[PDB]
Each structure stands twice: as C-alpha cells, then as structure tokens.
Write an enzyme that holds these catalytic residues in place. Structure first.
Site, PDB file in Angstrom:
ATOM      1  N   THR A 190     -24.623  19.967 -73.132  1.00 39.15           N
ATOM      2  CA  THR A 190     -24.215  19.157 -74.285  1.00 39.15           C
ATOM      3  C   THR A 190     -25.460  18.822 -75.100  1.00 39.15           C
ATOM      4  O   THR A 190     -26.514  18.583 -74.516  1.00 39.15           O
ATOM      5  CB  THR A 190     -23.442  17.891 -73.890  1.00 39.15           C
ATOM      6  OG1 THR A 190     -22.359  18.226 -73.020  1.00 39.15           O
ATOM      7  CG2 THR A 190     -22.876  17.178 -75.094  1.00 39.15           C
ATOM      8  N   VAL A 247     -11.080  20.094 -71.335  1.00 39.19           N
ATOM      9  CA  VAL A 247     -11.726  19.586 -72.581  1.00 39.19           C
ATOM     10  C   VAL A 247     -12.314  18.207 -72.261  1.00 39.19           C
ATOM     11  O   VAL A 247     -11.585  17.378 -71.717  1.00 39.19           O
ATOM     12  CB  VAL A 247     -10.738  19.513 -73.769  1.00 39.19           C
ATOM     13  CG1 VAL A 247     -11.379  18.844 -74.976  1.00 39.19           C
ATOM     14  CG2 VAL A 247     -10.223  20.880 -74.168  1.00 39.19           C
ATOM     15  N   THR A 269     -23.245  12.438 -74.189  1.00 44.02           N
ATOM     16  CA  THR A 269     -23.364  13.516 -73.167  1.00 44.02           C
ATOM     17  C   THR A 269     -23.113  12.871 -71.812  1.00 44.02           C
ATOM     18  O   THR A 269     -23.717  11.797 -71.531  1.00 44.02           O
ATOM     19  CB  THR A 269     -24.731  14.213 -73.235  1.00 44.02           C
ATOM     20  OG1 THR A 269     -25.009  14.856 -71.990  1.00 44.02           O
ATOM     21  CG2 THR A 269     -25.859  13.251 -73.528  1.00 44.02           C
ATOM     22  N   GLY A 270     -22.292  13.504 -70.993  1.00 45.23           N
ATOM     23  CA  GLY A 270     -22.121  13.085 -69.581  1.00 45.23           C
ATOM     24  C   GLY A 270     -20.701  13.333 -69.154  1.00 45.23           C
ATOM     25  O   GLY A 270     -20.095  14.229 -69.758  1.00 45.23           O
ATOM     26  N   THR A 271     -20.197  12.582 -68.174  1.00 44.16           N
ATOM     27  CA  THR A 271     -18.894  12.804 -67.497  1.00 44.16           C
ATOM     28  C   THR A 271     -17.782  12.785 -68.557  1.00 44.16           C
ATOM     29  O   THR A 271     -17.401  11.695 -69.015  1.00 44.16           O
ATOM     30  CB  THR A 271     -18.604  11.705 -66.460  1.00 44.16           C
ATOM     31  OG1 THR A 271     -19.791  11.453 -65.719  1.00 44.16           O
ATOM     32  CG2 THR A 271     -17.487  12.090 -65.512  1.00 44.16           C
ATOM     33  N   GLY A 272     -17.263  13.943 -68.966  1.00 46.95           N
ATOM     34  CA  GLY A 272     -16.414  13.974 -70.165  1.00 46.95           C
ATOM     35  C   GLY A 272     -15.184  13.063 -70.047  1.00 46.95           C
ATOM     36  O   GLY A 272     -14.887  12.341 -70.999  1.00 46.95           O
TER      37      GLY A 272
END
Ligand SMILES: [Cl-]
Ligand SMILES: [Cl-]
Ligand SMILES: [Cl-]
Ligand code: NA
Ligand code: NA
Lengths: 144, 135, 134, 149
Positions: C1, C30, C52-55
């Site tokens: 990301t 997604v 950015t990170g754990t979606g």
C-alpha cells in the site's frame, strides 16, 4: 424497546403514475416483511438475523430493485451488491458485482462470518461463497 | 435498493442493504450499497443506517457514518442528524434519496428528499406503519 | 500500500492511495484502499488522509473519515484525532498500520502502531524528512 | 503547501536489513516527496501532486502498489486505488484490476469520465480501455522479492 424499519428504495414515485391496486401491492409487501421482522424481534431474535431476513425477503420480492427484480446493466446483465453490519462487534460483510448468488445479503453475511474480509467482489466473492456451500444460480432468475 | 435496520431486545443495532444498482449502469459500477459508512452502517454506541439514492453522493458524503458521527461526536439527536445529512448535505452535493435509521435509544427516522421512499417500521408488539409518498 | 496527501498553494487538500493488497489474499478480497473514508479521504474543511494496514479494520472503523469527523465534529486537533484512531480505536478492533494526514492549516501527522511505515514529507521550498522505523 | 507520502506500514525489522537496503527505500521516498514539493512550489494542484506521487510509488518496485504488487493465493495480482479532491469532494476508485499499469490513473479516470466513484474488475478495465488507457499483462508487476514473500 425492539424496533425494525425497512425500505425498498427512494426516488421519483408519482401518485398520477400509479393506481391504488398498484400501491397496495407495495404496501402489502412492506407490511408482511416488517411484520415478520417485528415477530422475530418479539421472539428474541438478534437485530443481525432480523435485518438479514428482512433484506432477504426484499430481495425475493420482485417489486424491489434487489435480488429478484434487479435492474439491468448497459449490457442487459444483473450485477448485485449488498452489505450487512453488526453494531455489537462492528463486524461487516459486503459483496459487489455478483451475478450468480440468489441472495447477496446472505453472501454478505457469509463474508462477514466466514472470511477475514469485509468485502469481496465479482467471481472471487462467488467462488468463496460456493466453496462454503452457497448455491450457484443463473442471473436469468433475477429478470422479471 | 432495499434495506433494514433493527434494535433487538438485547440492545443490539444492525443494518443491511441490497441493490441491483443504477438502471442501465456501466458494468462494474459500484454505488453506496456495499460500502460500509456509505449505504450501510451500525454501531451500538450510536445508530444503524441503510441508505437509498444517488450512489456517488452517498459515498462522497459517507452518509450512513455521517449520521453516526454527527450524533456520537456532534451530540445531534437522530432527528437533527437525519435533517442535516438528508435535507442539507446530500442535496448540496447533488444527491437525492433517503435512509432509515434507528438509534441505541430506539428512536426511528425515515428521512428522504425525493417524491417517494417505499418504507415501513414498527416497534415489537405494536402495529406496523407503511409509506410511499411524503407526509 | 502507498499513498500521498498534499495541501497546495491555493489551500486545496487531496489524497490518493494504491495497493496490491495482502500477500496470499483470497482472490476478490477488497481492503480499505479503494473505499472513500476507509483508505482515502480529503475535504478542504478538515483533512486529507491516506491509510495502510489491516484493511477490514480500516473499513469497519472508517479510519480516514473518522480523523475528519473527530476534528470537524469532535473539535480534536489533527494530532489528537490521529492518536485516538491509530493508537486506541484501530488496535481495539485488532487493527495494525498507520496513515498520513495533512489538515487545511498545513499540520502533518504520520501516526502508525506497527514496527515501521515507509514515509516522507516536506513543506514546499524546504528539505524532505524520511522515516522507516519508530 | 506540503506533501506527505507513505509506502506501507508493517513489521519492518532493522535486524533483517542492511543500511544499504534501507537507503534504497529512503532514496525512493526522498525522490518522490521532492518531485511533489517541486510541483507544489510550481503551483500544481494538490490533486495532480497526489496523483503523480502515487503514480511514482506504483512505478517503484520496492512498494506494494503497481509494479512490485504482492501475489494473491492464486499467484495473481489484484490492484486497488482511490483518489479524492478536497475542494469538490469528488472521488474515483478501482478495485480488483489486473491489466492496468497505474491504478491511481484509472481511479482519476473514473472520477473524471464516469458518473460513479468506484468501478471494479473487468468492468473497470473495459471502462478504462474504451477511454484509451493501455492494457498490460499482470506479469509486469511481478518481482522476486514479493514472490519469495
Ligand atoms: Cl382500488
Ligand atoms: Cl417516525
Ligand atoms: Cl404514503
Ligand atoms: Na427483489
Ligand atoms: Na510499486
């Protein structure tokens, strides 16, 4: 005090366009679905299970633009989307651009409960759902 | 687009939304329905919301979460939050439609800025109400 | 990301975010990146954010819009809003990562709760600052 | 006027990396933020600056976006991007795209040339190809580093 509300879409609905008999078909469908949800809440069913079954019944009802009775794309296909969210855990599930799943809200609940994701799309969403035993349908079933 | 919001006897809120989307849409187009905070949001601390109407605007305004944030951070009532989003902010961005919302205290709102919204609600052990047109 | 946020000489904010997602992800999953309010948000009244990170957690917490709402409705400073979201609310849901945020007054924050975040920022006509670790 | 960029958050461990390895990341970040700073100074829009910064982070194989994207469970790439203008509150986004070299440019295209915020999958790709964006093979994204991960 438990309570449910539902909708079947907002838009340019005109009195001059519709008969009372046409209106009553919508009022009957809305009343039957909200009554089912009221009865489930009264019997102590979860908000999550109630909104799932209400939206499943709105999908099944051909009067509403969801599941059976979905509108057509520019290519005369159906592409369906759904989302569900649990206010207790803030878990959610969603699908978008699915054509081979009869009840997108059920696919959304399956993403919420059986995947590490909030959202899945397209054939990936479908393949994930089939692998967990949800049935494949033809998108022809949505056409009225 | 269809939706449901509920408060259960345990005090839990939930929301769900489903759609076939915008009529004659470009294949691959995605509206507010599957987007948390746009077409669908629920949080026991605030509100459960399901939205219907101009997808691109409900996304840009994060209409569902905006109700929750206006209540939780803003201290607005559900009615004040619903008015602000549906009657002021959404039309300001060219958006038409409505939403259903239930707060953690069991208040219900069904605001819409369109001619109609197919809608119904009811308290458990009470008689349902249905609507199509304004008033 | 990856992502970028900027405030231009006209006072306009913008944000953008792009990703390949998580290694070994389920096809069709997604995360927050393409979801307005989750991985990306900008509003001249408040802030521009890229996440950015754990979606799944950035979505559930609407991390990017929550910064904006905490500032706009909650009256929090950008620094207070960033602390609350990244160090308290995201870990409370099992989320790890960070974000970059610029407010309409040109304050910059680069909070993250992970071991690292590849990051850089700079004022126009000034020398850039870069970072990997805490 | 000011820019910030990121190239991802996660478990980056100093014990695993040399200074020379770190400096490749620092050099890439510094060059991109400098390009953005120079654009802002020249009076370029915040929208054009975040677009170019993210396009350069996509191009840079060190970062997980565009070239250097991670692999799915099926050894494919599925890319996503979003762009938002704080002035107009317009946004564009794509998800699940495999044949577009610069997802952030496809997202700008959705923002500018579609009635939608978001498009997904082949539909997003067809939308972009129909408007003259080039088709690539997802092979162009593949690196040894990300495969080994
Ligand atoms: Cl009659
Ligand atoms: Cl009412
Ligand atoms: Cl009526
Ligand atoms: Na239906
Ligand atoms: Na890259």
């Amino acid at each position: 005090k438990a309570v449910i509300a539902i909708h079947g879409g907002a838009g340019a609905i005109s009195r001059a366009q519709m008969s009372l008999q046409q209106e009553l078909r919508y009022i009957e469908a809305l009343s039957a679905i909200v009554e089912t949800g009221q009865k489930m809440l009264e019997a102590g069913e979860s908000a999550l299970d109630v909104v799932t079954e209400a939206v499943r019944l709105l999908e099944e009802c051909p009067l509403f633009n969801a599941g059976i009775g979905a509108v057509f794309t520019r290519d005369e296909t159906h592409e369906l989307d759904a989302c569900v969210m649990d206010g207790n855990t803030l878990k959610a599930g969603a699908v978008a651009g699915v054509s081979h799943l009869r009840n997108p809200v059920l696919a959304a609940r399956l993403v919420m409960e059986q995947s590490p994701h909030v959202m899945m799309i397209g054939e990936g969403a479908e393949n994930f759902a089939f692998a967990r035993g949800m049935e494949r349908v033809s998108p022809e079933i949505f056409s009225t | 687009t269809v939706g449901a919001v509920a408060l259960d006897l345990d005090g839990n809120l939930a929301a769900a939304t489903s759609t076939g989307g915008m009529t004659n849409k470009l294949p691959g187009a995605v509206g507010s329905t599957p987007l948390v905070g746009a077409g669908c949001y629920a949080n026991n601390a605030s509100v459960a919301v399901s939205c219907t109407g101009t997808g691109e605007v409900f996304i840009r305004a994060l209409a569902a979460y905006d109700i929750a944030a206006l209540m939780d951070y803003g201290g607005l009532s559900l009615a004040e939050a619903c008015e602000r989003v549906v009657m002021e902010k959404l039309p300001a961005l060219g958006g038409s439609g409505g939403l259903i919302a239930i707060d953690h205290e069991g208040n219900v709102a069904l605001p819409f800025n369109t001619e109609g919204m197919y809608r119904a609600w009811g308290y458990a052990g009470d008689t349902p109400t249905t609507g199509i047109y304004r008033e």
